[PDB]
Amino acid sequence: PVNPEKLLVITVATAETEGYLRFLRSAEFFNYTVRTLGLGEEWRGGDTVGGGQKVRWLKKEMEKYADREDMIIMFVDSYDVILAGSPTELLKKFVQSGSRLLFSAESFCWPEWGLAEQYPEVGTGKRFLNSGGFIGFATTIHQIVRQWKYKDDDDDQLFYTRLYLDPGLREKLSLNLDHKSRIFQNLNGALDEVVLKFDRNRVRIRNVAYDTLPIVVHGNGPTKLQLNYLGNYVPNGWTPEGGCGFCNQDRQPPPRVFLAVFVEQPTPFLPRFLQRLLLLDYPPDRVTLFLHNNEVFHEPHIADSWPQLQDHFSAVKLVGPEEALSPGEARDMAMDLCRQDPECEFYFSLDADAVLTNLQTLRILIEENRKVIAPMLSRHGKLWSNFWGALSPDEYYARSEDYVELVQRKRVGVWNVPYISQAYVIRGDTLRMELPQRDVFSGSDTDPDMAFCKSFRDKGIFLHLSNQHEFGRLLATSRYDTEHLHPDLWQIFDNPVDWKEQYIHENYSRALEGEGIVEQPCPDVYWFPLLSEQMCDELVAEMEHYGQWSGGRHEDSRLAGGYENVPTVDIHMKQVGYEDQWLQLLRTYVGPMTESLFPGYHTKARAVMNFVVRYRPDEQPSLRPHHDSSTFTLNVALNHKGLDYEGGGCRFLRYDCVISSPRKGWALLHPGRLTHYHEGLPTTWGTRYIMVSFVDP
Amino acid sequence: PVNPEKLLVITVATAETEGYLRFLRSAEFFNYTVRTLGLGEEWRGGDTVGGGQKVRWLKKEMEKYADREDMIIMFVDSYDVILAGSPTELLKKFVQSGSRLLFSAESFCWPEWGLAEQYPEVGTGKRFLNSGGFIGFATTIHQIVRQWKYKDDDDDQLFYTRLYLDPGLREKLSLNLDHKSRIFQNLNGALDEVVLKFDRNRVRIRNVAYDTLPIVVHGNGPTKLQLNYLGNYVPNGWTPEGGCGFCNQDRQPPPRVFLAVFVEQPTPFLPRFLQRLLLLDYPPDRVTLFLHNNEVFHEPHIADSWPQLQDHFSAVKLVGPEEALSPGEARDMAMDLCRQDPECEFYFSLDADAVLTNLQTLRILIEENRKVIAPMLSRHGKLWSNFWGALSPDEYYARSEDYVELVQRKRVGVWNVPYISQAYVIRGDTLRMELPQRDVFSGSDTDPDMAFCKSFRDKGIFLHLSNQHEFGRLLATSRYDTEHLHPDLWQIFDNPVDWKEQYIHENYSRALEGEGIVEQPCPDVYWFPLLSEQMCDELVAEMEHYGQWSGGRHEDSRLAGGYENVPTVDIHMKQVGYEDQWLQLLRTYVGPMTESLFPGYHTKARAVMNFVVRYRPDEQPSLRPHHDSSTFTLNVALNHKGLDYEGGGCRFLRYDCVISSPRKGWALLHPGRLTHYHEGLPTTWGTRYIMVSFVDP
């Protein structure tokens, strides 16, 4: 057994990039000893073929070990390598190979492809050398690297390849290749061969082609993204029993922050979004607000909330549609405002379609101490989120092996992902020292959101995505219909969660769960809060905006004294185009309320007659006794008694019972036939509005 | 002015028949003085041409007045004559004629038709002599009748005709004819010329051909029936202000009576008829009962009631179908039983289709002191009655000028009519002394009821019909369906009044009119008496007689917990063929009850689901919670709790209210949808029956 203390891992790194730090963490996890060559100096090794500087530094380092037969040295890259197994296991596998210097093997011959015939034949394994990782005795390695006498821009790979292809040297020093990836696993050309092998508190990779458990995972060539993926788990990235291994899990001045808000398309519930900005649990005197609105549709919305935002934050800036900025130039300008302000410690980009339910998001993200991190936001009950887990070869969306697991929060942690959007927090120093260019989001025909992620990947920055907590959701903005007086009224299908929070009474849900909010003012007439004040005001407004009320000749489905049809001044939902929306409200909220209050009854909230009635002393103030063409009737007040009108009660003749004082939010549920002959009392002043549905006719 | 004391009216009469008495009443009304020739002796004047005995008696009477120029004598028939005007008016018209002996005129020449050319020409009046009525001076009349020297069977008319046709005698004695019916009105040949002229307290006839008001109405020849008609009014028969002038209007042992009951066809509600016989307000020890039943269908009905009838009356006799009697032979035998029993003072015939609502009928009729009298009975709300007012020439039904007035009781009194049926009271002495033949109803191919009336008309007996009171009604027996276990159950259409009295609860009507019989045991569940005990027992019985109850696979229109269809063991009205009948009950009795209890609601009692449920511990004892496919539900108990079954209540879950003890007559009205989730509690012993209708589905 070779003493693990005789093993030394040597690697090259000119800076402490996240990839290098990721490498060290994996090495520290297995208690490896690591010598890092070239931390101070800068990389003259080029971009293409190169890395000759690697050999020069190694040749110098080796001279102090030139006679150490007792020393085993392993050389590996650091930016694109993670370790997966112990020094003890690594040394056992090395001795098993009977080699004195074992290079990693790969599927391709590079750079000179024609040398492929000088290589020995290998039945089913990888055939060619890869200088990304080799291991051998110090004496043997010294005899190899000693022969370096070339430029820093020359090909380190070709240097080793030429030595290995020397048949006499190959067998005199007994050099070998790890054909079946027992120790070194190069990913390029082998993606379909590699899968994660999980354990309780550590994760490995398994090669299913050769049924081996490699030690060194090298994401060489165009496999940086796959290595990022594997590196979220291997070795202690994320474990079934330990969870994430580098994030917070369990949560005196906070840093100054530049908050940038982007309205790049017509967005539902923007007033609610702007209102929510005042509620983020981050001291606003430490926040600077930049808001780009591109939509003339939203100029009134922004204008209404701007005085509150200016009072709230320490500094504010609006760039409206009159400036003719594209999304790419707007996001460039916002990010560059933080870059050029040394007091900007963090940059927080937030799009209008991002709904943050966790007011602590900025804190949580800032405390995770990453260069770039984004909270995971999902469309309600669907898989689409604000991140991608994988990329198609030509940089389109692809589903990663673990995407659904992350979106469904079956695995939670902070993940290295190739694409993030809609919300993210960027270290200010990173903008200053690593991405100093202005053209982050633009300068190409590429989409701005993709150009942003590409810009950071090209610099080797990690794009982190936290689903460690519930952060929020994403609004559906696809086909938002803007041609209404109040478009958010028509949003009950696309954004039902947000639609409920805005338009359903706040105490509806607790009234549905009992708690004694529902009342029964008259026998079998139930009274419950249904619509919020905003819904009523907006619904009345949309009716008056149509403005074509009924009158003479109007026929309603009421029954009074045989055939003397009883009319109302009203507008039917069908006329204003809101029928399908109202039926959906009936299905979702009135049905279950009815089935709770009338145990035994079942309904699917069928309604042919849905309409808003107007009562005025000047036209039709009252509604004479009658029955309804309905199994039950929904009677929703839409404005305040006293403030808006006087009188106008609802009277149930057979019970000598009167709803004298209706409530603006509240609905009456009463039977429509046989027992509940009712009349609407006269409206003596003002205007009275109610919403009526003859359901289950 | 001729002194009315010088006027003497002479007539002939061998007996005091009703027609002669009718004549005298009219004469006494105008204070005429009347000499009646030949009361003691018998009529040798024949049947054909005759009446010579009339002249012989007049010739003798005249000899004492042969020289009385101061005396005016009028000779008229008596059996077929009524007087219509005063002696004073009669004498004024006689003197106006300038005649010394004025004969009545008529349209026909009789007997010798060929003499028609010897008569003078008359422009528009009647041309020929009629010996039924003449008036003249006693001296002139004496000179005419003095010449009689012929047989008692010779033609009185030809004797006068021959004298009148003597041109010398005609103008020497100045004989004349009442061409234009100023005094004498002969009806034969002039029916269309004669109408009634009404006054406040007397009635006349007017001749519309000559616009005259005749004094003497002579129903000569085949006009006896028209004279009977006119004689009901003229002169004080019936008046607009005085009413009838010979009947009672205002009502120690009563006479012994033979009561004869006839069941000659299958008759509805015969058990009720037989029961009613015990209730006639006439002391039963004075009544003898004869009952002819021709229907084997009614033998059980007769048998059930016979012990009560035998105990009730002083003597009873049944002649059943085993005797093979026709209606004519049965009615002959019954009437002949009274004829041959001198203790039978009155004969009362009553058919099974005659319903006597006035228990005092026998008394009322007996106190009217007629030879034959019948109470007026009508089919409910129709014109058909138990009498005819007129006859077609070949003796079929015809509508008299005043028929509808009588049936509608616009004129009330005791009327001389040509045809009566179904109920009548006959003086026993009339059967003995005037109709002693056995063959009253039979002996011809004529219908028995017509042969009976013909038999009395041929003897000059009057058939009287009293509508002075409400007496009763006539059952519709036309197409009585006998092929049921209880045929009277299917009689709700033909005999709705009698059907209600038998099958609707006795207190239904008073519950409909308020009075606080209706109850409301649970909220909006109304409880009222609907069906009588007999209806329930007969309805259950008809169901079990069908005997094919539902079970597995049976599907009912109930709603419970979505789609888990709730069955009952039941029979639908459609299966036993009683649907149309039950819907009629719903329309007539459940509809108005529902509209009274739910003010505002209107219904026409539509019901697709009508069925009787059976509950037993051995098959289906209960009915789980559910709603009904109905606007409201009718739940009628059909038998007694305790006596017939145990347990089995009706429970309304949302109200925590239980109908623990239903009532056999009574119905529950409750809403079928939304509010009244109900379950039928288990039946622990016996059998429980209910009747259910899902009305207005």
Ligand SMILES: O=C(O)[C@H]1O[C@H](OP(=O)(O)OP(=O)(O)OC[C@H]2O[C@@H](n3ccc(=O)[nH]c3=O)[C@H](O)[C@@H]2O)[C@H](O)[C@@H](O)[C@@H]1O
């Ligand atoms: O850039 C290169 O020199 C190599 O990039 C690729 O091979 P790959 O394994 O994907 O390259 P990296 O692993 O990403 O970089 C080589 C090593 O040089 C070090 N390095 C690189 C870049 C740098 O700025 N500073 C620095 O220290 C890192 O240890 C890095 O791992 C090509 O296959 C080689 O032709 C080329 O020699």
Ligand SMILES: O=C(O)[C@H]1O[C@H](OP(=O)(O)OP(=O)(O)OC[C@H]2O[C@@H](n3ccc(=O)[nH]c3=O)[C@H](O)[C@@H]2O)[C@H](O)[C@@H](O)[C@@H]1O
């Ligand atoms: O039976 C008749 O002797 C007459 O009947 C008919 O004429 P009509 O006026 O209809 O006869 P009636 O008026 O019904 O009878 C003639 C009178 O004789 C008297 N009479 C008749 C029948 C009788 O039984 N007893 C009796 O006194 C009555 O006063 C009776 O009015 C015929 O036209 C005559 O041919 C016939 O002379």
Ligand SMILES: *[C@@H]1O[C@H](CO)[C@@H](O[C@@H]2O[C@H](CO)[C@@H](O)[C@H](O)[C@H]2NC(C)=O)[C@H](O)[C@H]1NC(C)=O
């Ligand atoms: C929802 O329910 C809450 C609690 O029942 C209501 O809260 C109260 O509002 C009234 C008047 O607005 C105050 O007098 C109470 O002091 C409040 N109580 C609490 C605990 O806040 C609330 O008003 C209801 N929502 C609506 C829209 O009516």
Ligand SMILES: *[C@@H]1O[C@H](CO)[C@@H](O[C@@H]2O[C@H](CO)[C@@H](O)[C@H](O)[C@H]2NC(C)=O)[C@H](O)[C@H]1NC(C)=O
């Ligand atoms: C119809 O109503 C009458 C009066 O309300 C009921 O008469 C009574 O019957 C009960 C028991 O049968 C007796 O205790 C009372 O003394 C009766 N009162 C009178 C005034 O007769 C009668 O029972 C009802 N009809 C039915 C079928 O129930």
Ligand SMILES: *[C@@H]1O[C@H](CO)[C@@H](O)[C@H](O)[C@H]1NC(C)=O
């Ligand atoms: C690493 O070394 C420390 C002692 O320095 C030891 O406590 C720890 O268990 C080692 N970990 C592994 C994974 O060998």
Ligand SMILES: *[C@@H]1O[C@H](CO)[C@@H](O)[C@H](O)[C@H]1NC(C)=O
């Ligand atoms: C008939 O005579 C009596 C007197 O005897 C007289 O009182 C009555 O008014 C008279 N009636 C008529 C109708 O002339």
Ligand SMILES: O=C(O)CCC(=O)C(=O)O
């Ligand atoms: O409460 C009212 O004003 C009458 C409403 C009503 O009953 C109806 O819309 O038919």
Ligand SMILES: O=C(O)CCC(=O)C(=O)O
């Ligand atoms: O009262 C009962 O027995 C249940 C009757 C009922 O509800 C039904 O027939 O549907």
Ligand SMILES: [Fe+2]
């Ligand atoms: Fe309407």
Ligand SMILES: [Fe+2]
């Ligand atoms: Fe209504």
Ligand SMILES: [Fe+2]
């Ligand atoms: Fe049924």
Ligand SMILES: [Fe+2]
């Ligand atoms: Fe039911």
Ligand SMILES: [Mn+2]
């Ligand atoms: Mn590498």
Ligand SMILES: [Mn+2]
């Ligand atoms: Mn006559």
